Amino acid sequence: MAEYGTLLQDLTNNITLEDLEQLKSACKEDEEITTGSAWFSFLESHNKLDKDNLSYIEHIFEISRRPDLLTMVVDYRTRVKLAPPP
Amino acid sequence: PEMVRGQVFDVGPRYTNLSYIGEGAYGMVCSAYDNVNKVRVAIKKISPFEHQTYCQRTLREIKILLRFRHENIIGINDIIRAPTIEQMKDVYIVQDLMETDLYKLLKTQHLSNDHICYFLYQILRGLKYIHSANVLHRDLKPSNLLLNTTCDLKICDFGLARVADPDHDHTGFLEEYVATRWYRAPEIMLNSKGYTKSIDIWSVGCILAEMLSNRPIFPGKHYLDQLNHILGILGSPSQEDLNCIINLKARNYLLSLPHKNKVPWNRLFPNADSKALDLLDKMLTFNPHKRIEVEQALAHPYLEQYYDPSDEPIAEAPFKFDMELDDLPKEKLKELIFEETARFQPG
Ligand SMILES: Nc1ncnc2c1ncn2[C@@H]1O[C@H](COP(=O)(O)OP(=O)(O)O)[C@@H](O)[C@H]1O
């Protein structure tokens, strides 16, 4: 419950304002005005993120080409009759 | 409305006696008797035009396939759709009925060196054409290579194809429709832009290795696992290999991984032809700039007996016209689909 928050912070410390833009583009079809940790709490309040619901961020980190981010999610989910040619 | 397996398959009075072939990437696939040409054909049903990227997938598949004329690319023989745009809720593509695909074939046979050689040639022969049209297939895999027992090979499914532009920013449209990344180029997987024709060569390389041993070369289950599989065989990337990576956060990730040694190709393919592996080594080069190009591959000593530049035709209608710039209103794409398919109506 509280260890999910520990690695929500870990992710937020590694998302610069510019990376944030590359991440929301990856959430294409799914409002602009968000900044950093506001992204996580948007996903959470649209049922795309839980302590147990990691599917979406795992996907977005791949599309955004962020193994560094995804590696933290993985790590703290593992803890928690043919004829001859011529 | 003649219908197969609980689904509506309205292929008109021309195409009759339907038989379920299998479930495809666009939907149901059937064989049908073409009453005009007196032969059995293959029919793909492509349905809901309610999702934008699916309409995209359809336009690409049509537009590209419809302006290609090559021995080693499947062609569209007919398209069935409703006369009015409002009534057009699905589209039927009609192609040559092919006996099998290379996935089904490697699933059953173990191929002789001679068979592999000819198949590889045809893949590359068809590819030389695709590339000269300025087109990237992006989905080259065994299941996308159709055969019949005469050994004629036809490259199929151009729904993920894009006009070759290194300046194109990756959107995830690729992974939206293909989750398996066994045949994905390493630079596709960690860059976000700069994809060149050499992504298709990589795939063919993967297809070659899979023809030699029937097992896929890089069968990674997930994203990070696929990277690990590549470096597991190719060895940890060199000083300038790393310089191919624009994404610094990806470059650092690869550097953080433990060192892996190169596995020599002859140790992985004990009784494969020596000429076959030297070619493979060039097709599966991490560095996309060092990696062999199509025209050069055809000229490789392994394909010595099939190589004939005069019988290797290039595209006449290349995609210089149309940078293509899709990713726009879905209602507009549906119109373009209606437009492209119009040359098969009663008129
Ligand atoms: N031209 C054809 N003739 C006969 N069968 C075909 C033909 N094209 C495709 N099929 C079969 O239809 C099914 C799926 O079509 P498709 O979606 O193009 O394959 P994929 O899912 O790899 O893109 C498969 O069983 C495939 O082998």
Q: What is the CATH number of domain B1-97+329-346?
A: 3.30.200.20
Is the C-beta atom of B62 inside 6 A of ligand 1? no
What are B294's two structure tokens? 């199509």
Q: B180 near B206, Cβ under 8 Å?
A: no
Tell me which chain A residues have a C-beta less than 8 angstroms from the C-beta of B115: 82, 85
Residue B218, number of CB atoms within 10 A of its CB = 23
What are B81's two structure tokens? 């759709």
Tell me which chain B residues have a C-beta less than 8 angstroms from the C-beta of A64: 192
Structural domain spans, chain A: 1-86
* Superfamily of structural domain A1-86: Death Domain, Fas (1.10.533.10)
Nearest CA to B195 out of B246, B230, B155, B240 is that of B246
Nearest CA to B185 out of B171, B214, B205 is that of B205
SS3 A83: coil
Contacts of B322 (CB under 8 A, 6+ apart): B163
What are B149's two structure tokens? 């027992």
Q: Do A82 and B52 touch (CB under 8 A)?
A: no
CATH 1.10.510.10-classified regions of chain B: 98-328
Contacts of B286 (CB under 8 A, 6+ apart): B186, B230, B234, B237, B238, B241, B244
B148 touches chain A (CB under 8 A): no
**Whole-angstrom Cα distance, residue B336 to residue B332?**
6
Tell me which chain B residues have a C-beta less than 8 angstroms from the C-beta of A86: 118
Contacts of B319 (CB under 8 A, 6+ apart): B64, B133, B134, B135, B163, B164
Residue B29 annotated as lining a ligand binding site: yes
Is the C-beta atom of B42 inside 6 A of ligand 1? yes
> What's the Cα-to-Cα distance from B247 to each of A58, A65, B153, rounded to whole Å?
18, 8, 37
SS3 A77: helix
Q: Do B250 and A62 touch (CB under 8 A)?
A: no
Residue A76, number of CB atoms within 10 A of its CB = 17
Q: B203 near B185, Cβ under 8 Å?
A: yes
Q: A32 near A42, Cβ under 8 Å?
A: no
**Whole-angstrom Cα distance, residue A79 to residue B299?**
52
Instruction: Tell me how far the alpha carbon of residue A45 lies from the centroid of ligand 1, in angstroms.
Output: 41
- Resolution of this entry, Å: 3.2
Q: Which residues precede a break in chain B, with C-to-N distance above 2.5 Å?
A: none
Q: B113 near B104, Cβ under 8 Å?
A: no
Is the C-beta atom of B250 inside 6 A of ligand 1? no
Which amino acid is present at B101? D
Mutation site, A15, A55, A65, interface B, largest B CB count within 10 A:
A65
Q: Can you count the helices (H) and strands (E) in chain A?
A: 5, 0
Residue B22 annotated as lining a ligand binding site: yes
Q: Which residues precede a break in chain A, with C-to-N distance above 2.5 Å?
A: 30, 80
Read off φ and ψ for residue B127, nearest 5 degrees.
Answer: -70, -45
Give the 3-state secondary structure of chain B: CCEECCEECCCCCCEEEEEEEEECCCCEEEEEEECCCCEEEEEEEECCCCCHHHHHHHHHHHHHHHCCCCCCECCEEEEECCCCCCCCCCEEEEEECCCEEHHHHHCCCCCCHHHHHHHHHHHHHHHHHHHHCCEECCCCCHHHEEEECCCEEEECCCCCCEECCCCCCCCCHHHHHCCCCCCCCHHHHHCCCCCCCHHHHHHHHHHHHHHHHCCCCCCCCCHHHHHHHHHHHHCCCCCCCHHHCCCHHHHHHHHHCCCCCCCCHHHHCCCCCHHHHHHHHHHCCCCCCCCCCHHHHHCCHHHCCCCCHHHCCCCCCCCCCCCCCCCCCHHHHHHHHHHHHHHHCCC
* Superfamily of structural domain B98-328: Transferase(Phosphotransferase) domain 1 (1.10.510.10)
**Closest Cα of chain A to B344: distance in Å?**
34
Q: Helix A67-78 to helix B223-234 angle, to the nearest 10 degrees?
A: 110
What are B60's two structure tokens? 């690409």
**Whole-angstrom Cα distance, residue B29 to residue B101?**
14
CATH 3.30.200.20-classified regions of chain B: 1-97+329-346
What are A34's two structure tokens? 């968000």
Q: B40 near B33, Cβ under 8 Å?
A: yes
Residue B27 annotated as lining a ligand binding site: yes
Nearest CA to B135 out of B102, B168, B103 is that of B168
